[PDB]
């Protein structure tokens, strides 16, 4: 069975960089399909952020393409999201998920992460 465990700062100050890590176990990132990042806004509107293939190719949503950076680390088997210069807009619960691809049926996200809630608050938090 495949498992996706998410971790990272659940609260960042505006103008800073949000960083989330998605640890995968039971299947290697380099082995095959697509590794995506998506966010769920409080107003219930899912948005596809982007992905990184098993080869290492990136594909970002044009809406955020100039800010984010989805990298990986084959050794530890985990991919990351890095959304630069955040704003109150970026306040959402982020999900990492795997999507398969069959030439006929197309893409489909079959394995989802737990979901990491991030808040762009100006508040102070113990690191």
């Amino acid at each position: 069975e495949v498992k996706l465990q998410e971790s990272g700062a659940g609260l960042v100050q505006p103008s800073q960089s949000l960083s989330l890590t998605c640890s995968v176990t039971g299947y290697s990132i380099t082995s095959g399909y697509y590794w995506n990042w998506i966010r769920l806004f409080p107003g219930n509107k899912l948005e596809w952020v982007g992905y990184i293939s098993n080869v290492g190719d990136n594909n970002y949503n044009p809406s955020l393409k100039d800010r984010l950076s989805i990298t990986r680390d084959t050794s530890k088997n985990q991919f990351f999201l890095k959304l630069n210069s955040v704003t109150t807009e970026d306040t959402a619960t982020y999900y990492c998920a795997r999507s398969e691809y069959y030439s006929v049926t197309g893409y489909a996200m079959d394995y989802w992460g737990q979901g990491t809630t991030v808040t762009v608050s100006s508040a102070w938090r113990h690191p």
């Binding site: 596809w48 949503n61 006929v104 049926t105 893409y107 489909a108 079959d110 989802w112 737990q114």
Partner: protein
């Protein structure tokens, strides 16, 4: 950029009866339409892919039809944990876009 419209928006029902949600896209998508289930606890699962194909584990009471630009998601009975928010995406071209959402409540 294509955009879907999940209607009805957050409609409730009883403790065991059929319900039909829909998803209409701005442009034309072949049949590349998936359906997700967001549990109240935040757990999101895949239910249907390619407008009608069932995923592993999803009960037989889940259907899926439509084509062109109009789609569906029928259920047999909400008995008992069918209560969650349902979404729908397309994938004929990047970027992928989801629907507005459709919460399912029990009166």
């Amino acid at each position: 950029d294509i955009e879907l419209t999940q209607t009805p928006v957050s409609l409730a029902a009883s403790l065991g009866d059929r319900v039909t949600i829909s998803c209409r896209a701005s442009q034309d998508i072949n049949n590349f339409l998936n359906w997700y289930q967001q549990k109240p606890d935040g757990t999101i699962k895949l239910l249907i892919y390619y407008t009608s194909r069932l995923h592993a584990g999803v009960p037989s009471r889940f259907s899926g039809s439509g084509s062109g630009t109009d789609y569906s998601l029928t259920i047999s009975n909400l008995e008992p944990e069918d209560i969650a928010t349902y979404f729908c995406q397309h994938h004929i071209k990047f970027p992928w876009t989801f629907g507005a959402g459709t919460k399912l409540e029990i009166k």
